[model samples]
Target: GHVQLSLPVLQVRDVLVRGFGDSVEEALSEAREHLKNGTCGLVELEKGVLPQLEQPYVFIKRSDALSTNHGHKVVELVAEMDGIQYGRSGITLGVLVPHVGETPIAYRNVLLRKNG
Candidate 1:
């Protein structure tokens, strides 16, 4: 029999992108770039959580669409470091983190590996 390993995923949701209707798509694109360029400002991975999202992790890249689904947008868990990219089976919950009166946006649940 093959030994199996199990790990838990820690998720966080925030306003990854604050759009202005026509500019929403533009904002999303910027957010994605920020993550790729190491400007997402993430402090660290979630407490008591594992960084399975680190490199060597299996994943996929998706296309652009209506900025409703948070799972498709960039993700941030803390402030100070760049954001993490999304992985398979991960989901982001779109909500108002900057408080009311802000345009709703999408967020991604990024998984960061510990070995990276």
Candidate 2:
């Protein structure tokens, strides 16, 4: 007589969802959309002062760990302006910018997300 064996694979959720918006409404919406559509990407954060701008701004660049040739219009929101000043080096964070308009405006403490 022969016996049948059964095996099961464990499903784990390793991905983390981080919100980067001014308010709960904006952050929740963006995070939910990214989770649903899979537009999340890693970003390297750096603090710098733009030549034209008076106040300092956080410079962002896509991480080289997961590089691709498409979907380059991703931005993130800064909850605290002074948070980045105490950093020693660039830090990596997950972000997904929501599509709002063609000519998006980038204001202080807020970075607009666009899909091109």
Question: Tens digits of per-residue lDDT for model 1 on 23-72?
Answer: 33443444345445543322123332223222221222322223555442
Q: By summed lDDT, which 10 consecutive residues of candidate 1 come out lowest?
A: 1-10
Instruction: Kindly list the per-residue Cα lDDT of model 2 for residues 1-116, writing each as its tens digit.
Output: 11221111111111122234545455545544553463433222323322222122223323333456565433343332333432233532322333222222232122244433
Give per-candidate clash totals.
13, 0
Q: Residue 42: error of model 1 in Å?
A: 6.4
Which parts of model 1 have CA positions greater than 4 angstroms off? 1-22, 42-109, 112-116
lDDT scores for all predictions?
Answer: 0.29, 0.32
**True-structure lDDT of candidate 2:** 0.32
Evaluate residue 73 in candidate 2 and report its C-alpha lDDT on the 0 to 100 scale.
38
